[PDB]
Design a protein around this nucleic acid. Structure first.
Ligand code: SF4
Lengths: 1138, 261, 261, 261
DNA sequence: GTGAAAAATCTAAAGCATCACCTT
DNA sequence: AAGGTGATGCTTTAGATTTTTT
């Protein structure tokens, strides 16, 4: 990019920010500010030298706003050999004359350095430039030349590692001088001769109300085709400033005039809209643009507008004598987004994508609106909305303003506080926490915390190629074996149903000698209350003995169970807190031997196991050396079309890796019948307990911060209830502001906490340690299998889902007990007993006695202590447990179940097909009906009978072929709604049903149907062209809305029946495949679990798999299986030699 | 050292291809009298027994009794390589972990000396004493093979009845039932194709039909078989192998228990 | 009651091999003139006619008109485990819901019985009028079967084109199209190898090729085949038997409507 | 143009049965000397050379050299239509992408035609050096095929040692191991089952068995197979296609470089 | 949005039973 | 003239891929 273009861009952005009312402070003075925006911008200094800076955009309480251009030189670090630090600086200071701002030495600790606690700091060479463009110039000059040197391993050759090179520059300013978003600042502008001064004002915390512009559109479209960007015109546009709403219509495509009207779904959201009507597009676009000019917003709000609304509006404006660049400031960038030079662009779909913890079944407007806001917006179909508006456009107006109000209030209630609480700790401007994934924001947070510890930061790791584990065996995938998820049984477990319980008296004898210990530990560690203040200890410690003895003498019973979700709220944060495991500390024996802290009988080692999984090629070292030496000097097609022939030795690593994988995908396809062999082995890791605590303490700090903020949220909620009972407006408003601030802070902290695990193993993450995830998930599996074996002793486990066990226990088991304590803080303390015994068993086997801490850094004082925060919270007695069973031999469904709360409401669905994507609508309303109808009944057979009286309805529908049920709702009853991931030419030779229907639409409509990503492929399978696979029968639903003779011609050329005379949907659809689909669903959910619980078959309309029925008839046969050993006498025992 | 050489070797091929199907693991046993097999199946439902006598072999040289638990599907797969008229020599050392098989081709030109390793396992050892068998019939092998392929398309439980009118093979199943009645021979001149009966009392028993399919893989081994049954005793299927020896398939019935009466 | 003694079993057995894939379940017709079947295809395209006359068999004994809804696949399984030279006795009852099969051997010592249940089935009956067909062509069974089962490698539908000079078995598809030409023979003595072309007018027709592959399953049952057609009528395929039975295939043509004009 | 007739159809189609699976792309080059195929699969370890001389064909006439870039898997689905003795006829034009196959019956009555299309391609033609062969063997196709499909069940990698006394085929794996020894025969009368080995120095190599399984699909084509090997030279499998042609498989051995020492 | 696991397809290969040929 | 034997279609099942839930 030419520097003249950069200067023109900088002066144009300065003028544009001036006309949006962010005037720059030029005079000396004090000001108060609240940062809402950071941008990187070139600002010319007093020396008339090209130089970057960051524009902060502050707003104030009264609505006045301004900007501050702070210059800070971009910089990074380079690593040199010991004794070769000053010479590198000497060389570097005579080879970029007029380019380097300065160079210096900033010593920092390392994370992977041996003998790191003796007192050494590997001093780095800090290099600082003037502008970001020169920074990119120098990195492209220097980084690959020595990066390849480091990968394969003149004074320039002695630099070993360019560190911290992928960081954004403005994020480095946000880390360095400690200016985060959404804090109050005191800014002193003392003139041009000195840089502007910024300080943090933490006394004031009340959040001001910014200026926000939400907007949504409607678009005219020709039928069956989504609207285009060169013939269509904006149908109308609606928008929102701070709750107030304005709509701008267009007369030539509306049918009558509409006046001002309001639309409120609930008293929380007020929807006052003022409507303006203009004859053509010119007045529409000019009025919208000038209203943006007069209002001067600071943050935009869209709803899936980054790929649909902004490109179409820009393309429509640029042809009508205008420009989005010179009018509003919106354009594409290097990442295919729309980033304003003076405004923050908020895409409310990204928050649903990342932070809402929702599946991908709820990203559209209606489901994401009803999932978080709490109301159902008006449904409108895009195909007939134009024709509907031509008759009367008031419902069109309702839909557009519903889009606007939904996206705006979805922002201001949930996305706005959560995002503005995320950026108080993450050094990102708001347009970065929303867009980037959970990995990058946690990376920046640890960036901050590790800059606070003065340690240099690891680079984003290089992707490993041609993986070599033991002997050849090039791995397609290298993985750690995750949480052991198992459903041990299947069927119903209801609270009042009787269940046969076998019980081991030895386990009850074991608990005889430990009730004293369990109820000692239940108060000495979980409530921090010593026993010297409670006096009811003998009452509980003979009541439990009496109850457990009453259970002991009859260890085989039939009575009602209690269902418990014995789990940990956040086990993955809790283990990484407890064991002091660090992704910068897991080391092998050689580096520990290099340490001078390897004293005899040391405690700085901690051992742990984990399970490693590999899917690898059957080929050996020779069979891969042959194909890599063979591919030496042969031509390949270039990536650029119409290019010259290019050879192997200058290929990029990605394309050559893909070609090697493709070659070995068919070399061994005809030599060993398989492409990868699944291998699971054991590995052992040794972990230092004295490495930088920048991670475990950070997790701990956020854990106790979440606890504290939850306590403040509770007391502020009680204050808010008292305040709304009072009715004084100012104190209610202040309390509500503080309440939402603290709630968003705690929700942001827990969203950080849950994703500390998920960041470590990510490709391109600075702290990439496979061992972290491996050993933490192995420990989380070992603790839960200890829990599962103890429960299998004293009851019945039902589910293990790598967070906790689900359990049915006898009803006379000791469940929970109270305690009268004389302490003023805790006059009464209640605690559950199964949780307590789980705590004591995990502090009999998981005590980190080597949990190490620092006391005196100067004298190297190290203190060992014991603490286990691993607690099995109980969720009380639920009402019902549902597990499904599989058709396949032996195995059954995992990670999917359905639990109910006490009052009959649905507590939690999980992993089921009711709310999946890519599933038919017949197998979802079915599941939702049968689960809510399931809980009825008296005994075990009554439940299955009652649920068969509702699951047989959806067989009566399909056998009758929907005669009385109107065909109007038939069309969406079957239609598939799967979504694509790539383009059709990206798939290449791969074939499936979605690719087939996309290619059918490719030869039915234009090629532009399938060019855009995320296409919603819709298809059903017909009946007449039998014999073929179901690939060629995937006809679209799109044809049924087209012109009739077009349907006839395409149907003739597609399903190949020229003699056909009837074209009804009721006969073209083969009902046998749909009956098969619903039957596989009903035998996943009901039939097989019913058979597995010795119950007569509830629904006889579907048949079992052959392994089930045969065994059933055998067990109900007059003859009984008689073996040979019990039948007839024995001889003895023997063994066989070598 | 244990070396056993036999001239016509299709017999040892077929007898052990009939051993692969029924059981997964067997207990090879060697002694002066002959080769013994007394290993049960993995389901602990049916039993196989082999006594391959030494006097039939062309050459036999054995040291003492020794038991080794060689798997059977592996020996059957490697033994399929041999031709239908090969000369078979089993060789085992005194304390080695590998046994060898020598196949000598009918052309007197091709030699094929293979070997396989051993593995250890834990299997019950059982001994069958002598009980009077009330009903014994002599069945041609191909006729019994058509019987087992004929009843098994009906169900999985077989009635093996022996009455004055003869022998009855029945089976019930989801598509109905099947009844096959056979009478003894009176005026036939040949023995390998005839059927003979002998009885003490009428016998009314039922057995597992799948395991009969597992049994009857030794049909072309020899054209005759002994079917023996009595009250509450395991069914005896005695397939004799030439002058070599014999095999007993022991099929434990699933005896009716008094529950509803 | 109903008794049906049939000496040569193949003329029943192979027939089931020609039906189990084409019609999964059908209604049977019997009479004193033999057995008549009008079976309708599963996918509702084709029809199959079987007329096995009474004196072509060995013995029948019937009282009145009976219709048995015997499912094809299970009775095909029952006959799958029989003998070729086996003599078969079919037994049926007026009111009972079972059908009996008796297998007996020329050696007199191999007799078996089977019982198969029946279920009620509703199949409509169509009366095809008798029309003078323009094209009647005679080919041997083997060449017609091979040409169908090897031209189905080309495409998915066939076009037959008959004139004075011969018939044209063309078929088009993704890999290309293939046409098959037949000449005339005058120096042949044995009637199976003899190919002749009978003309009334040149005829153009198009037919389902997959159905031609499914049609050529009764080719071991016969030795010669006659294909007949006329103007806009379904193809009729006849596998004439030696005065024991008679076979008809009705393949409704997929006529080309004028949609491009 | 190009019109070709060959009375012996089998000698063509079985040839292409050897090429249905191993290679899926064909680049025919035709000249006055005959027709030539030089293909090499995407595995980059297997080469096929197929030459049919002009004089072997019954009638041969060609105008100029042509390049025929047509996939080879397609017509293996197409040349199984013709019978055994059925005469093969090839029709090709100067620059038409359409090839015509005609199957002329030996009774001059049953003819046919199919048409095939070619694609575009860019395939490098690798030269074949003429080097001396250390060990050669002329040995029956049936016995080699039996050796291959018998050792394909034991292991997957084969050790072939062509010594002076004969040849050893060793197969090792998890199922066990086994080696088979063949020697040269001297007192043999007929040459369709005789063996003969020539020696310069003993060659022992390690090969692949699935490639050998794909090679020996054409065992009914010829009764003699010429295997030639040397030190780090690919196996040459030569089939003498009647008298006209030779099919040559070139297989690069899996030479294990020293890494463990 | 880790990893484990599910649903739903092609798909390619092993094993098997059945039929054509051939020799004893 | 019939049973061994090989070719070959039929049948079942592991598995390669995608989307999605967790
Ligand atoms: S655990 Fe001890 S020996 Fe190992 S790296 Fe840490 S301080 Fe050094």
């Amino acid at each position: 990019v030419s520097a003249l273009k950069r200067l023109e861009r900088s002066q144009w952005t300065d003028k544009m920010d001036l006309r949006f009312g962010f005037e720059r402070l030029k005079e000396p003075g004090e000001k108060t500010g609240w940062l809402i925006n950071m941008h990187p911008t070139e600002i010319l200094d007093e020396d008339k030298r090209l130089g970057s800076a960051v524009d902060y955009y502050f707003i104030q309480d009264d609505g006045s706003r301004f900007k501050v251009a702070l210059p800070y030189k971009p910089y990074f670090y380079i690593a040199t050999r010991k004794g070769c630090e000053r010479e590198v600086s000497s060389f570097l200071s005579k080879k970029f004359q007029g380019k380097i701002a300065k160079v210096e030495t900033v010593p920092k600790e390392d994370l992977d350095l041996p003998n790191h606690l003796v007192g050494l700091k590997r001093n780095y060479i800090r290099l600082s430039f003037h502008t970001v463009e020169d920074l990119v110039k120098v990195r492209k000059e220097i980084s690959p030349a020595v990066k390849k040197n480091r990968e394969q391993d003149d004074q320039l050759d002695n630099i070993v590692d360019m560190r911290e090179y992928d960081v954004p520059y403005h994020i480095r300013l946000s880390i360095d001088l400690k200016i985060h978003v959404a804090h109050w600042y005191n800014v002193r502008y003392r003139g041009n001769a000195f840089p502007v001064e910024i300080t943090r004002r933490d006394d004031l915390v009340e959040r001001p109300d910014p200026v926000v512009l939400a907007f949504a559109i409607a678009t005219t479209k020709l039928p069956l085709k989504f609207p285009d960007a060169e013939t269509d015109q904006i149908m109308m546009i609606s928008y929102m400033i701070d709750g107030q709403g304005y709509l701008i219509t267009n007369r030539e495509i509306v049918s009558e005039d509409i006046e001002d009207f309001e639309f409120t779904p609930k008293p929380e959201y007020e929807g006052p809209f003022c409507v303006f009507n203009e004859p053509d597009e010119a007045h529409l676009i000019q009025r919208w643009f000038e209203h943006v000019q007069e209002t001067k917003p600071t943050i935009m709000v869209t709803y899936n507008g980054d790929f649909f609304d902004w490109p179409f509006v820009e393309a429509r404006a640029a042809v009508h004598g205008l420009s989005m660049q010179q009018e509003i400031g919106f354009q594409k960038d290097s990442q295919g987004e729309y980033k304003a030079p003076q405004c923050i662009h908020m895409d409310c779909l990204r928050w649903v994508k990342r932070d809402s913890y929702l599946p991908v079944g709820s990203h559209n407007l209606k489901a994401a609106a009803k999932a978080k806001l709490g109301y159902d917006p008006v449904e409108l179909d895009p195909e007939d909305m134009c024709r509907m508006a031509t008759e009367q456009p008031q419902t069109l107006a309702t839909y557009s303003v519903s889009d606007a109000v939904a996206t705006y209030y979805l922002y201001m209630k949930y996305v706005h506080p959560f995002i503005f609480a995320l950026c108080t700790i993450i050094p990102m401007e708001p347009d970065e926490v929303l867009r980037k994934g959970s990995g990058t924001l946690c990376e920046a947070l640890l960036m901050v915390q590790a800059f606070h510890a003065n340690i240099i930061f690891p680079n984003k790791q290089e992707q490993e190629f041609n993986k070599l584990t033991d002997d050849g065996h090039v791995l397609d995938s290298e993985t750690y074996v995750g949480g052991h998820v198992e459903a041990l049984e299947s069927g119903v477990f209801r609270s009042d149903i009787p269940c046969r319980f076998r019980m081991n008296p030895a386990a009850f004898d074991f608990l005889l000698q430990r009730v004293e210990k369990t109820l000692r530990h239940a108060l000495e560690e979980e409530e921090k209350v010593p026993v010297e203040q409670v006096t009811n200890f003998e009452e509980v410690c003979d009541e439990i003995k009496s109850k457990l003895a009453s259970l002991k003498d009859v260890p085989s019973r039939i009575e009602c169970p209690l269902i418990y979700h014995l789990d940990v709220g956040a086990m993955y944060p809790n283990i990484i807190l407890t064991n002091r495991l660090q992704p910068s500390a897991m080391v092998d024996e050689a580096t520990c031997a290099a340490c001078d802290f390897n004293k005899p009988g040391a405690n700085c080692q901690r051992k742990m196991a984990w399970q490693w999984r590999g899917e690898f090629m059957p080929a050996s070292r020779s069979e891969y050396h042959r194909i890599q030496h063979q591919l030496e000097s042969e031509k390949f097609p270039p990536l650029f079309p119409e290019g010259p022939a290019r050879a192997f030795h200058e290929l990029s690593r990605e394309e050559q890796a893909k070609y090697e994988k493709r070659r070995l995908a068919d070399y061994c396809r005809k030599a060993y019948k398989k492409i990868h062999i699944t291998k699971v082995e054991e590995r052992l890791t040794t972990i230092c307990q004295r490495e930088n605590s920048f991670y475990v303490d950070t997790v701990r700090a956020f854990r106790d911060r979440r606890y504290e903020f939850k306590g403040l949220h509770k007391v502020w909620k009680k204050k808010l209830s008292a305040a709304v009972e009072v009715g004084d407006a100012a104190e209610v408003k202040r309390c509500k502001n503080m309440e939402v601030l603290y709630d968003s802070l705690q929700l942001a902290h827990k969203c950080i906490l849950n994703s500390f695990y998920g960041y470590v193993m990510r490709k391109g993450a600075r702290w990439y340690s496979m061992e972290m995830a491996g050993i933490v998930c192995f420990t989380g599996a070992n603790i839960i299998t200890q829990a599962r074996e103890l429960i299998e002793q004293i009851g019945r486990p039902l589910e293990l889902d790598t967070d906790g066990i689900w359990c049915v226990l006898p009803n006379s088991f000791p469940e929970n007990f109270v305690f009268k304590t004389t302490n003023v803080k805790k006059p009464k303390v209640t605690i559950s007993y199964p949780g307590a015994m789980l705590n004591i068993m995990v502090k009999e086997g998981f005590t980190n006695d080597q949990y190490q801490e620092l006391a005196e850094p100067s004298s190297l004082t190290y203190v060992t202590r014991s603490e286990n925060s691993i607690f099995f919270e109980v969720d009380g007695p639920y009402l019902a447990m549902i597990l499904p069973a599989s058709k396949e031999e032996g195995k059954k469904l995992k990670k999917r179940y359905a639990v109910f709360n006490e009052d009959g409401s649905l507590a939690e669905l999980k992993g089921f097909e009711v709310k999946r994507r890519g599933e038919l609508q017949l197998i979802k309303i079915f599941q939702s009906s049968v689960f809510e109808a399931f809980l009825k009944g008296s005994t075990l057979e009554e439940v299955y009978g009652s649920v068969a009286k509702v699951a047989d309805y959806w067989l009566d529908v399909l056998y009758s072929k929907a005669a009385n049920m109107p065909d109007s709702e038939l069309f969406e009853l079957i239609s598939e709604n799967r979504s694509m991931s790539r383009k059709l030419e990206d798939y290449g030779e791969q074939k499936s049903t979605s690719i087939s229907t996309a290619k059918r639409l490719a030869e039915f409509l234009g090629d532009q149907m399938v060019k855009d990503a995320g296409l919603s492929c819709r298809y059903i399978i017909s009946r007449k062209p039998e014999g073929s696979p179901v690939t060629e029968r995937a006809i679209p639903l799109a044809i049924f809305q087209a012109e009739p003779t077009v349907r006839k011609h395409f149907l003739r050329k597609w399903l190949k029946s020229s003699s056909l005379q009837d074209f009804d949907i009721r006969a073209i659809l083969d009902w046998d495949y749909y009956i098969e689909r619903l039957g596989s669903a009903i035998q996943k959910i009901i039939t097989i679990p019913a058979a597995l619980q010795q119950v007569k078959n509830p629904v006889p309309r579907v048949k079992h798999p052959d392994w089930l029925h045969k065994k059933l008839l055998e067990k109900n046969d007059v003859y009984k299986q008689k073996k040979i050993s019990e039948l007839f006498t024995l001889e003895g025992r023997r063994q066989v030699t070598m | 050292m244990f070396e056993a050489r036999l001239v016509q070797g299709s017999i040892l091929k077929k007898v052990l291809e009939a051993l692969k199907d029924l059981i997964n693991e067997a207990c090879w046993d060697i002694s002066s009298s002959g080769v013994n097999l007394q290993s049960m199946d993995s389901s602990h439902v049916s039993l196989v027994q082999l006594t391959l006598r030494s006097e039939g072999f062309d050459t036999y040289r054995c040291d003492r009794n020794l038991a080794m638990g060689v798997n059977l599907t592996s020996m059957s797969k490697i033994l399929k390589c041999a031709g239908n008229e090969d000369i078979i020599t089993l060789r085992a050392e005194d304390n080695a972990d590998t046994l060898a098989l020598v196949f000598e081709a009918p052309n007197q030109e091709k030699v094929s000396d293979y070997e396989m390793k051993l593995m250890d396992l834990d299997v019950e050892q059982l001994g069958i004493p002598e009980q009077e068998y009330s009903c014994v019939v002599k069945m041609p092998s191909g006729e019994f093979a058509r019987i087992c392929r004929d009843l098994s398309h009906i169900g999985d439980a077989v009635v093996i009845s022996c009455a004055k009118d003869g022998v009855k093979f029945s089976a019930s199943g989801e598509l109905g039932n099947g009844n096959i009645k056979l009478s003894q021979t009176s005026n036939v001149d040949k023995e390998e194709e005839a059927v003979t009966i002998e009885m003490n009392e009428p016998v009314q028993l039922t057995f597992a039909l799948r395991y009969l399919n597992f049994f009857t893989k030794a049909t072309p081994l020899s054209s005759t078989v002994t079917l023996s049954m009595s009250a509450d005793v395991p069914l005896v299927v005695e397939y004799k192998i030439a002058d070599m020896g014999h095999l007993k398939y022991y099929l434990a019935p699933k005896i009716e228990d008094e529950e509803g009466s």
